[PDB]
Amino acid sequence: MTEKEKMLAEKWYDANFDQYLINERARAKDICFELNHTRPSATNKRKELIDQLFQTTTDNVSISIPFDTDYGWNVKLGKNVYVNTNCYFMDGGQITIGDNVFIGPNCGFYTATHPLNFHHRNEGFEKAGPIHIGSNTWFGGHVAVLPGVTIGEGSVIGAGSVVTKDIPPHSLAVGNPCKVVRKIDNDL
Amino acid sequence: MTEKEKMLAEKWYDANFDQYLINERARAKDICFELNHTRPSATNKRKELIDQLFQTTTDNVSISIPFDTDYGWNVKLGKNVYVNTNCYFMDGGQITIGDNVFIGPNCGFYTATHPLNFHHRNEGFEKAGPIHIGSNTWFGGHVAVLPGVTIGEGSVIGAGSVVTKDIPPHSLAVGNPCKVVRKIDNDL
Amino acid sequence: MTEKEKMLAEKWYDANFDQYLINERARAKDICFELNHTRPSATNKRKELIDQLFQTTTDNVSISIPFDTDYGWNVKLGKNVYVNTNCYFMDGGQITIGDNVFIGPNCGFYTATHPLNFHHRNEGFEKAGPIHIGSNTWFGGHVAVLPGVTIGEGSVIGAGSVVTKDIPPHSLAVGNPCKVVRKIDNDL
Ligand SMILES: CC(C)(COP(=O)(O)OP(=O)(O)OC[C@H]1O[C@@H](n2cnc3c(N)ncnc32)[C@H](O)[C@@H]1OP(=O)(O)O)[C@@H](O)C(=O)NCCC(=O)NCCS
Ligand SMILES: CC(C)(COP(=O)(O)OP(=O)(O)OC[C@H]1O[C@@H](n2cnc3c(N)ncnc32)[C@H](O)[C@@H]1OP(=O)(O)O)[C@@H](O)C(=O)NCCC(=O)NCCS
Ligand SMILES: CC(C)(COP(=O)(O)OP(=O)(O)OC[C@H]1O[C@@H](n2cnc3c(N)ncnc32)[C@H](O)[C@@H]1OP(=O)(O)O)[C@@H](O)C(=O)NCCC(=O)NCCS
């Protein structure tokens, strides 16, 4: 397998020294830079950049600057997704975001693990753990979501949370580590 | 009431689809953008932008870039307020900052709540909870202050704190959630 | 002593009103601004700026934008140091970083303490507590490292950690406050 295929199959891959992945990260980063230096009221320019970054035709995806991602094409987005300032979608592992998602400022969605053993880590290896973000969710600011985590549909993550484990749907969860506090009444 | 008046009166308001608030947020964001792209040594330009953003004549308010706010005019500032890099004053609810305030880097002052019910939330409703920051205070970096929180005068908030409840004056408080650790001797 | 010499000797110094330190912070902040506004693929320009900022000839030090530091020359770097987006090396106290160091996004390395007494603090005084970062270390994103803290070689700091005390070598440590969870097998 290529190191890309490895990455996408949840296997250890050489994130650092693989030329194809290096170049793909460089593509995303230069688009992020342009976007981060595009005036917020330049609506069409920003939409075009966002669509180029994510390699998709977004439907009411609003990204406040600055924004960062590793690949861009490995973030799959629903409609009506509001991302406030200073978020980072580190998407070596796929980041799936549903519809009607409110993301607070300074949130990081982190799919990259490195080996704990420094000898393996220094050789460039990573393993990507996909993140799935349910539809109809809200994240407060300053949240980190760690590799492999799924947040169920209808759930609310409190500001400052570090989400180390999956959160069931219809749940209010807060803290470091993030723990479910109570169920949310999502009735019509 | 207009949605603005609702916002300012602590009532549920349509933050997302109200044109007047949309345009007011767009005003602030374009000023922030200009300020964030103004060389740090361009003293006068930065002061003029800051005064335009906050709609006031500031006295020794120093804002390190980047900075963000939603309205700008809903942040009321004392003199001698030092705001380090990457702070966000999300001021739908008023944010009152006293004199001689030191704000560390990456601090978020968050006044916005959304409904927990995703049906109400997806309709664009928010409720703003004012933040009051006492005079003679110090915030470490990476702090988040949540809606409705008052930090008393003379108090110190430790780096990484998530401040969910009011902090009494003359207090050292740290943690997630932030809790008072001890009293501070602020004697002359 | 000059206030610089005081700063570097772990004594209370006037950080705010000393002209020489003010001008040194202005040098670093204008280099950061240029760097933060240099296209990520402008490899040689970014290296020249990084070497100017740190006043050294770096060996495979890669800094993702944006980046911030107070002095630049008070950060001493090994080789193979990877710094992801939105870090702040607040280096009034020396920040020593070893070889083969992976630093996650939105990490703050904070050497500045202010007096707790608001009277002394408002007079501009600080005391700098050096940070030492071991070789062969990995920091997840959203980590704050507080003044005086040493992280031993071969150690891993989990995302969201607030590191208030020294962490021994060969350790996995996480949390707010950060606590050692287990030893890491770093064997060849
Ligand atoms: C969780 C949240 C939604 C508030 O929920 P809440 O249940 O009304 O808050 P409560 O008063 O019930 O707090 C319940 C307990 O949980 C704690 N708590 C609430 N939010 C917390 C958080 N984010 N982190 C840690 N603890 C938290 C409170 O300290 C409280 O402690 P107690 O056991 O002494 O009562 C809060 O994070 C919030 O407002 N988040 C969004 C803020 C924000 O980021 N806005 C910007 C994005 S729009
Ligand atoms: C709170 C602070 C001032 C340290 O204060 P301190 O007087 O050293 O407090 P202590 O170390 O006596 O605190 C006692 C306990 O609180 C804990 N603690 C201290 N700061 C903490 C924080 N920020 N978060 C969580 N726990 C903290 C310590 O781990 C200590 O644990 P113990 O039970 O093992 O003793 C620290 O947050 C700080 O320096 N903040 C500013 C650093 C910074 O952000 N600088 C950049 C902006 S200038
Ligand atoms: C700790 C970390 C490094 C991985 O370690 P890990 O082996 O999953 O941790 P463990 O499972 O041994 O730890 C056991 C406990 O620690 C908790 N934990 C793990 N990471 C944590 C974190 N960052 N903060 C708080 N708690 C954490 C778990 O909830 C678990 O609880 P339990 O034992 O009660 O179930 C995690 O932060 C991580 O994935 N870090 C990198 C993520 C990142 O930032 N990537 C971007 C930069 S590449």
Coordinates of C-alpha atoms and ligand atoms in Angstrom, one line a residue, chain A residues 70 88 90 108-114 116 126 144-148 162-165 175-179, chain C residues 84 102-105 107 138-143 156-161 172-177 181-182, ligand 3:
Chain A
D70 CA -4.2 18.9 7.1
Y88 CA -8.2 23.0 13.4
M90 CA -6.6 17.6 11.7
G108 CA -9.4 21.2 17.7
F109 CA -10.5 17.9 16.1
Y110 CA -7.5 15.7 16.4
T111 CA -7.2 12.4 14.4
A112 CA -3.3 12.0 14.7
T113 CA -1.7 9.7 17.1
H114 CA 2.0 9.2 17.2
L116 CA 4.5 6.6 22.5
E126 CA 1.4 8.1 12.8
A144 CA -10.4 19.2 22.0
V145 CA -11.7 16.0 20.4
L146 CA -9.2 13.2 20.4
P147 CA -8.5 10.4 17.8
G148 CA -11.3 7.8 17.3
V162 CA -11.3 17.3 26.3
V163 CA -13.3 14.5 24.7
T164 CA -11.3 11.3 25.1
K165 CA -14.2 8.8 24.7
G175 CA -15.0 18.4 31.5
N176 CA -11.5 17.2 31.2
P177 CA -11.9 14.3 30.6
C178 CA -15.3 15.0 29.1
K179 CA -18.1 13.0 30.9
Chain C
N84 CA 2.1 23.0 14.9
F102 CA 6.7 17.2 18.4
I103 CA 4.6 20.2 19.7
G104 CA 0.9 20.1 19.0
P105 CA -1.3 22.9 17.9
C107 CA 0.2 25.0 22.9
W138 CA 5.4 14.8 22.2
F139 CA 2.8 17.3 23.3
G140 CA -0.8 16.9 22.2
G141 CA -2.7 20.0 21.2
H142 CA -4.2 22.6 23.6
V143 CA -1.5 22.1 26.2
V156 CA 4.3 12.4 26.2
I157 CA 1.8 15.2 27.4
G158 CA -1.9 14.5 26.4
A159 CA -4.0 17.1 24.6
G160 CA -5.6 19.7 26.9
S161 CA -3.1 19.2 29.7
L172 CA 2.8 9.6 29.8
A173 CA 1.0 12.5 31.6
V174 CA -2.5 14.0 31.0
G175 CA -5.1 16.2 32.7
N176 CA -5.7 19.5 34.3
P177 CA -3.7 19.4 36.4
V181 CA -0.6 8.1 34.1
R182 CA 2.2 5.6 33.3
Ligands
LIG3 C1 -3.0 10.5 26.1 C2 -3.0 10.5 24.6 C3 -1.6 11.0 24.2 C4 -3.2 9.0 24.2 O1 -3.0 8.2 25.3 P1 -3.9 7.0 25.7 O2 -3.0 5.8 25.7 O3 -5.2 7.0 24.9 O4 -4.3 7.2 27.3 P2 -4.8 6.0 28.3 O5 -5.9 5.4 27.6 O6 -3.5 5.3 28.7 O7 -5.2 6.8 29.6 C5 -6.2 6.2 30.5 C6 -7.2 7.3 30.9 O8 -6.7 8.6 30.5 C7 -7.8 9.4 30.0 N1 -7.2 10.2 29.0 C8 -6.5 9.9 27.8 N2 -6.1 11.0 27.2 C9 -6.4 12.0 28.0 C10 -6.3 13.5 27.9 N3 -5.7 14.0 26.8 N4 -6.8 14.2 28.9 C11 -7.5 13.7 29.9 N5 -7.6 12.4 30.1 C12 -7.2 11.5 29.1 C13 -8.8 8.4 29.4 O9 -10.1 9.0 29.6 C14 -8.6 7.2 30.2 O10 -9.6 7.0 31.2 P3 -10.0 5.6 31.8 O11 -8.6 4.9 32.1 O12 -10.7 5.9 33.1 O13 -10.8 5.0 30.8 C15 -4.1 11.4 24.1 O14 -4.1 12.8 24.4 C16 -3.9 11.5 22.6 O15 -4.5 10.9 21.7 N6 -3.0 12.5 22.4 C17 -2.7 13.0 21.1 C18 -4.0 13.7 20.5 C19 -3.4 14.9 19.8 O16 -3.4 16.0 20.5 N7 -3.1 14.9 18.6 C20 -2.7 16.1 17.9 C21 -1.2 16.3 18.0 S1 -0.5 15.0 17.0

